[PDB]
Design a protein around this ligand. Structure first.
Ligand SMILES: [Ca+2]
Ligand SMILES: [Ca+2]
Ligand SMILES: [Ca+2]
Ligand SMILES: [Ca+2]
Ligand SMILES: [Cl-]
Ligand SMILES: [Cl-]
Ligand SMILES: [Cl-]
Ligand SMILES: [Cl-]
Ligand SMILES: [Cl-]
Ligand SMILES: [Cl-]
Ligand SMILES: [Cl-]
Ligand SMILES: [Cl-]
Ligand code: NA
Ligand SMILES: [Zn+2]
Ligand SMILES: [Zn+2]
Length: 316
């Protein structure tokens, strides 16, 4: 809508206060004009019709419980936008400042969130398995990273390609979480999963085995569930990324850590320059080695650590 750019204030799903960019035209709308072609957040009002209504609020204060998922989908879309722009010089998910649209209060008791090709969609969860999913910055960034992948490598969502696709979203979801700098970690969905249970999450990048996921290629899942194990086999690449950043000795293979920023550069370059729709794990290792080579030189520590990390997870 046309109107005045304004800054409201509210509380997200976890109860923290944050400022949000709005547009004033009789009501204050969740429309942030400061980022690319705009960030727009909509109320689906418990229906499944999309996108719903551009979110309108009378007074520019967003402290009601009903407001919290909207606050976070809007705010974390902005953080994700800032991450890709400031850290990778990428303007929105398509590199051309495409508007970011998100709908919250999608359906009822819906325990999921997804990028549908044109927008983000967030369930409220059922209150037991999940609370509203936009409350997890890593979830928001994980899903928007699928759009980045769709606009770059186009990794196919099945088997090893699909597990790379998932791991890319977990890696950049986590890097966004660290960029936001509030309560980062190397777990996925910890903020919104199982409100009754402290210290769990959907999966762990530092220790995939904590939740039954493989941490080595010899333990790869080869069944047909989950599109050939895309959220299961992602543990193998997630652990490799964790080793590259933080180091460790995994199955007796020592990896010298090079930090989060360099992990980010290496994988972003691999994703945008070298991966193709059918890249398998071995081809990912080759792309990451080539990317670290381009960035740091063939004799660098960074190249050696990428090699160690893939060796440690059994990806030749
Ligand atoms: Ca209000
Ligand atoms: Ca966290
Ligand atoms: Ca996390
Ligand atoms: Ca929990
Ligand atoms: Cl919050
Ligand atoms: Cl509307
Ligand atoms: Cl309330
Ligand atoms: Cl997913
Ligand atoms: Cl481990
Ligand atoms: Cl180990
Ligand atoms: Cl380890
Ligand atoms: Cl190699
Ligand atoms: Na699991
Ligand atoms: Zn995903
Ligand atoms: Zn280990």
């Amino acid at each position: 809508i046309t109107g005045t750019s304004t800054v409201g204030v509210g509380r997200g799903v976890l109860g923290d206060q944050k400022n949000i960019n709005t547009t004033y035209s009789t009501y204050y709308y969740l429309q942030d004009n400061t980022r690319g072609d705009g960030i727009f957040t909509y109320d689906a009002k418990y229906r499944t019709t999309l996108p719903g209504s551009l979110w309108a609020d009378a007074d520019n204060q967003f402290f009601a419980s009903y407001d919290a998922p909207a606050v976070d989908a809007h705010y974390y879309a902005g953080v994700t936008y800032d991450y890709y722009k400031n850290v990778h010089n990428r303007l929105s998910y398509d590199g051309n400042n495409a508007a970011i649209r998100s709908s919250v209060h999608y359906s009822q008791g819906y325990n999921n969130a997804f990028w549908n090709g044109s927008e983000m969609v967030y369930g409220d969860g059922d209150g037991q398995t999940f609370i509203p999913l936009s409350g997890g910055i890593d979830v928001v960034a994980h899903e928007l990273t699928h759009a980045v992948t769709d606009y770059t490598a186009g990794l196919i969502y099945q088997n090893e390609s699909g597990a790379i696709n998932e791991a890319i979203s977990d890696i950049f979801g986590t890097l966004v979480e660290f960029y936001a700098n509030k309560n980062p970690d190397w777990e996925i969905g910890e903020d919104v999963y199982t409100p009754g249970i402290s210290g769990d999450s959907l999966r762990s990048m530092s220790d995939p085995a904590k939740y039954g996921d493989p941490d080595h290629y010899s333990k790869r899942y080869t069944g047909t569930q989950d599109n050939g194990g895309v959220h299961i086999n992602s543990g193998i690449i997630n652990k490799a990324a964790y080793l590259i950043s933080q180091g460790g000795t995994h199955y007796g293979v020592s990896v010298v850590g090079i930090g989060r920023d360099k992990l980010g550069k290496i994988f972003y370059r691999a994703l945008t320059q070298y991966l193709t729709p059918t890249s398998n794990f071995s081809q990912l290792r080759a792309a990451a080695v080539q990317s670290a080579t381009d960035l740091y030189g063939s004799t660098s520590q960074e190249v050696a650590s990428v090699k160690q990390a893939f060796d440690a997870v059994g990806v030749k």
